[PDB]
Design a protein around this ligand. Structure first.
Ligand SMILES: CC(=O)N[C@H]1[C@@H](OP(=O)(O)OP(=O)(O)OC[C@H]2O[C@@H](n3ccc(=O)[nH]c3=O)[C@H](O)[C@@H]2O)O[C@H](CO)[C@@H](O)[C@@H]1O[C@H](C)C(=O)O
Ligand SMILES: CC(=O)N[C@H]1[C@@H](OP(=O)(O)OP(=O)(O)OC[C@H]2O[C@@H](n3ccc(=O)[nH]c3=O)[C@H](O)[C@@H]2O)O[C@H](CO)[C@@H](O)[C@@H]1O[C@H](C)C(=O)O
Ligand SMILES: CC(=O)N[C@H]1[C@@H](OP(=O)(O)OP(=O)(O)OC[C@H]2O[C@@H](n3ccc(=O)[nH]c3=O)[C@H](O)[C@@H]2O)O[C@H](CO)[C@@H](O)[C@@H]1O[C@H](C)C(=O)O
Ligand SMILES: CC(=O)N[C@H]1[C@@H](OP(=O)(O)OP(=O)(O)OC[C@H]2O[C@@H](n3ccc(=O)[nH]c3=O)[C@H](O)[C@@H]2O)O[C@H](CO)[C@@H](O)[C@@H]1O[C@H](C)C(=O)O
Lengths: 416, 416, 416, 416
């Protein structure tokens, strides 16, 4: 079955355009279910996960059409409010339809997500929020059911600033009676994008991007047209690629405000970075300086760039420590990096990376979306050739990584 | 030597006035060193740690006068910029004079803090910030020295949203040439109070309380008059006391905006809480519902109320999990709680509290400020009598806890 | 694709015969490569992993024949000493041919194992041991190569009492010149079985099952006939099944000496256990008492029964804590148990299990061998029907679990 | 108050005689309470902790006499079986009189140990064992009471191979009716010494030093004469001193069998070690090679040499990782090492030591017995002078460390 073949490459040089954010568009697609009319989403990335959630919207009876990076949803005449086991198992972001469906129908039944490659990942804080809004919660044979005679706005505190729980509860709150206050809200840029979309549909959401979100519920929302924000994680991936290959890459159609920790840490590692209004230039250093990273809720260092930064550190000039505070098990890639000659030792949530002279190409497997991209970055600097398996992990969340890296001068091909 | 004797008490009832914040006033006292004139701080709590940092200001040559909760500092004619080993060992918040002294003199030498009861507690992020502003850092026999021909404003990223590093770097930045940007800043209320004081002296500090602080440096600051914010941790201590004793307590001279996670979690445990503009009423439940707590950077659940909430949970109606993400070793109190008949098991940063019918009075020792207060709360509900040793831990950070609890109906005395 | 369907079952009752140990036979099959003649292994379990390592022996040029639980190996005329990427990826126990091949040929090249479902799982201690015996170690594009002009016996210390490193180093030492001492050796029963087999071939291995193994190297080993020990993990699985179903099961063809922690902990949970010379009877309690388990090196509680005991605890009468000290990531099953209505919270290496009234059948996926068996145990007690996917995990290490449970009265079928 | 002053020293050279084991003699002194007659213990080290437990024996009514490294106990006419709060707080090894007193009187009441510098340190496994022998356990105001009409031998499993629980339960079992089996027993050398002493008094204890101890109870024990084993931790301290100072030290009156992991790891770091029947010679390397250490139950690497090895690693030629699996909080020394210019970063139970060119003398505080000795070792290699406070930690468990190091050529003095 299919492989990505990467060879030892020249320093990457040129421009790369970044696609629309996967993690902005998935919650915004769920949010289209809130509205009694037709939404138009522009800058949608052509990714399998976008097409899976589209099929979940079709399952509940929305009219969905995709072409040329535009998705339209007519949720006027939704029929059903159950998300079946197969769709939630394909893509756990399926769970983000629970808030809108509860808000629209006052009842919903959603398959509970199971095991995940990067950790246990419970959805208790989502349920906490729905209960605070007056929903009664029951489990039935792997499904979570939430139902109420009417959602009522209430104050609630998030024990952790969960992205998904913030999104699900903001969407449920948008049609509740009265005012909801989410305390200790996630501050991620995708939260702001979602809130902006809800306000475009006629909602009243204030404070997104701060620690407190206030939602004043409205009776009805209407379809709206929205431009999704750029993918800050894809942008960061190409920025790391410039750092690791001693390259010179201009990343186009980005928002620097969303990349601050990645810019800071790449500068600490020795990159020269030029921030512009719609683009950033990254010049890799001749010697990578070892740095430590600690993943945290935004605007701390993002867990979605942890594997990529770890790959950079495998050839840094000394010892770097990577601490993962956000996910339990997000070190599955370490054994694959070690197959390529890295020197990485883990205990608990910390990995000690002892820089080596060079990586060596080897047969490796993608374990998840972001680690698979980290393996491509390893492959560009590893002596010889690297063959990466289980490539569906990568292909589901990066648009045409083979074409984009090829245009920057790298040696990469997908063999089917 | 001295003991606090607590007996099984009646439900606490009445009003308690909260003192000025220890953790607001300590950095604000350091900040008075920035100014060429006389500052006046009102609402200063009469605590030993306030009197120790006052003696450190006298050591560097400031004129300090304390009476009736007002402290005045004339830093016009500071002489020296070294903080010796004895003062830093007495109180590690001594380290917060490093930023102001570097900013005033372009040189400072500060004893590095050593072991602490609640964890290792490095000051690497403070030094990271001073280096970003152009200081060269050297160690000499237990001292850290920072020196520059001139501080220059620069962008810098905090790997963790350290309270102390945020404070130290904001104060150093206030007299630097140009603009400093602190990314991933601490959002704690004391950060806002300090920033407000710097702006009262003539600084230009924007964004305090958000994830990004921008400081535009000025050439000179002038003495100013400031009213310190209330002590949110003392307020939380009395709120927990009402919860544990099935009491009814109005906490006076507080800011509800600063207590949101404590209010939320006490409500989840079954308290009825009435929030007013300058006060909060807490009515304890007849049965405490078990809750989980996870400490986090503000506005997440504060590590400074973790031991007190754990004490509450020792008699809750089931199993509660306490996770400490902020400090390494902040479970030293567990063995003292277990001497009083608690059922607490720890592994790593998590403690599993299995509620018991009642605690039993025993001889126990305060291990640190907030745990010592938690032992007083245990003592109010424990059958018989509790004798608490090593009481300097408590007395250094609570104003007259014996008099305040006595006025709420509790049985407590300090025996010398 | 294929599923295991389990229904809510009657209490299990009857006898079950246990097969030969998977984890005894895999290293003993590698060990047959040490000998210049024909070995005969009896009591070999009919498992896919036995058939994969058999194909690896054929790959290096041994004559292998399997029938009716007997495997014969003629390693007289081995040809090659490389274990390719495909075979090591299929089954990481492939790596155990490295010691014998190094000992026979003074050179070997083995694909380094990559990611694993239950943790990173480095093989550094194996290499440490080969280096101590005089091998030079090099990496080539995902392979580890070990080579020497002659293995020489030496003292070496294991930083952790690794089962695999103990096995690999004992086998390499068996043909070395002089005496090897393994300090802090694994004490697992399979170590003793392997040592007994090496001594049957003419080796000199003393101390297996203690903390120190002494190997005096011989010039030549000869094929021998060996009876593999019973599978203590399969035995423990059926013992837990009796505990969870309030059953009464006699487990046949077992060694009680190998099951001591499982017997102790089942007795603590309320089981009545009768230990006999070749069999054990387990009578489940009417109420399961909550217990804590901490996995450790033998003769501590085995990590290979951790998921199964956790499943038992999901319906115990209170709160149980499971700590995994042996593997990093061995909690992937928790999310599947939670789909069936368990109440399990993890942080770090500890899981807090809050017993529920009953589990509910749901669609779940096996994540690994022992967790998949734990899901079958959940299925026997869960209301309704449970459908388990990814069943190759189970089928590769349990002989006919459907037929054995069916004969004890349970409702289980494999649908293809 | 009192300080230890250490200066930058010459390489240590010469012989040092090791004293009797503190951790052998403390349980053996408790064990003298089992006997109706006079015991004679030879090779007792002249330490404060020996004199505290002696005062506890006097408290319960034993006749105790100490002179010239010989302690005699006549426990013929013991009166009382309570260990009061003051004595247990002075020295938690006081708790080891619980087993003998329960065995002699069928009742005992012992103050429960509270907080400790190196972790929580519960005594649940001791109580588990006493309950298995038929004792009923109750808590009364900080005391644990154990009482029975008669101890009866039973099988029991230790969830962790606790040294103290093994000792306490073996001593209680020695006078029980019938046979006790301790499964997953501690294997530490002090367990063997204690068992040998019990057998000298007329007990029947088999398997000490293995994973299973069988005690066949006797009706009466008689006073006996015993030679305590050497202090393996003191021996290891001087061995590390030779390693760190590039010295050449013969450690006299030791048992190499008890030092295997320390010898192995010092050899891995580059020491040349000569093992003899009663002595070991350690020659420090000119460059220390970085090594990793993981503390474990004997015969794994001892937690009591972890701080000392960490100190060695602060100047090793690269990066070393220290993992503490045995104690929770045993990293309090890290902040003191960092005051001396070390580069140590901790997360969870792991510390990353990045070797520096040299340490610099500074004012530091002992946090516990073994860390305080590690600070002396730092002081011998640190530029200039080191002043160590809180020296009672050191003096309570090392005999004349100033005189022994002075005789090896080091510069050390105690100033009072
Ligand atoms: C669709 C989408 O946006 N997915 C992203 C979002 O996941 P989400 O699931 O919302 O993230 P969280 O809830 O903030 O999870 C953060 C932490 O909080 C715990 N938690 C979360 C929810 C809850 O109810 N209870 C609870 O305990 C949770 O287990 C985790 O440890 O945020 C993550 C963090 O940045 C990203 O890694 C993730 O990308 C992924 C990889 C991808 O592109 O495939
Ligand atoms: C004077 C004062 O305000 N002290 C308070 C302040 O400590 P501070 O020291 O500033 O807190 P941090 O820097 O936010 O520390 C948070 C975490 O960050 C790590 N870190 C901190 C700084 C650095 O350079 N490097 C680094 O790694 C650090 O080790 C810790 O794990 O904030 C703490 C957290 O809320 C409080 O518990 C503390 O109160 C105390 C108890 C009291 O009243 O005695
Ligand atoms: C074939 C076989 O016998 N496999 C078994 C054996 O694995 P092994 O791999 O030998 O186990 P370890 O080396 O004792 O591993 C124990 C720990 O030691 C770390 N370690 C191991 C080796 C090394 O070089 N370096 C190193 O750090 C390692 O990462 C782990 O955390 O022992 C395990 C522990 O009981 C079993 O779970 C495992 O069964 C499996 C599931 C199955 O049936 O599929
Ligand atoms: C008097 C004496 O011999 N003391 C020593 C002995 O302590 P002990 O207390 O017996 O050690 P453990 O019981 O083997 O403790 C090991 C681990 O087991 C947990 N545990 C222990 C008992 C129990 O009931 N429950 C439980 O959970 C415990 O918390 C720890 O994490 O063994 C330790 C380990 O080698 C030594 O560090 C210690 O020396 C000291 C420093 C000194 O010289 O001052």
């Amino acid at each position: 079955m299919a492989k990505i073949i990467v060879k030892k490459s020249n320093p990457l040089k040129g421009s790369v355009k970044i696609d629309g954010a996967k993690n902005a568009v998935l919650p915004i697609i769920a949010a289209t279910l809130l509205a009694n009319g037709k939404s138009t989403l522009n800058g949608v990335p052509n990714l399998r996960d976008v097409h899976v959630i589209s099929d979940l919207l079709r399952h509940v009876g929305a009219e969905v059409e995709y072409k040329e990076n535009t998705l339209t949803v007519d949720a006027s005449n939704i029929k059903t409010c159950e998300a079946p086991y197969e769709l939630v198992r394909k893509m756990r972001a399926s769970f983000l339809v629970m808030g809108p469906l509860l808000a629209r129908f006052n009842s919903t039944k959603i398959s509970m997500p199971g095991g995940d490659a990067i950790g246990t990942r419970p959805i208790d804080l989502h349920l906490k929020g729905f209960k605070a809004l007056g929903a009664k919660i029951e489990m039935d044979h792997g499904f979570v059911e939430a139902a109420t005679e009417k959602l009522v706005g209430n104050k609630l505190y998030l024990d952790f600033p969960s992205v998904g729980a913030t999104e699900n509860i903001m969407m449920a709150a948008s049609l509740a009676e009265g005012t909801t206050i989410i305390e200790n809200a996630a501050e991620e840029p995708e939260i702001v994008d979602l809130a902006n979309f809800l306000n475009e549909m006629g909602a009243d959401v204030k404070g997104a991007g701060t620690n407190t979100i206030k939602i004043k519920g409205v009776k009805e929302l209407k379809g709206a047209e929205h431009n999704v924000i750029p993918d800050r994680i894809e942008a960061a991936t190409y920025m790391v690629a410039a750092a690791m290959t001693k390259g010179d890459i201009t990343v186009e159609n980005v928002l620097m405000e969303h990349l601050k920790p990645v810019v800071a840490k790449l500068r600490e590692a020795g990159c020269e970075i030029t921030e512009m209004d719609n683009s950033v230039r990254v010049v890799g250093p001749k010697v990578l300086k070892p740095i430590d990273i600690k993943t945290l809720p935004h605007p701390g260092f993002p867990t979605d760039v942890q594997a990529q930064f770890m790959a950079m550190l495998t050839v840094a000039n000394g010892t770097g420590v990577v601490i993962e505070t956000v996910f339990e098990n997000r070190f599955m890639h370490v054994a694959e990096f070690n197959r390529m000659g890295a020197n990485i030792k883990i205990d608990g949530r910390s990995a000690v990376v002892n820089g080596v002279d060079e990586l060596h190409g080897a047969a490796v497997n993608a374990t998840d979306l972001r680690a698979g991209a980290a393996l491509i970055l390893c492959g560009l600097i590893a002596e010889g050739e690297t063959q990466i398996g289980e490539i569906y992990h990568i292909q589901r969340g990066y648009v045409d990584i083979d074409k984009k890296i090829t245009a920057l001068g790298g040696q990469i091909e997908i063999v089917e």
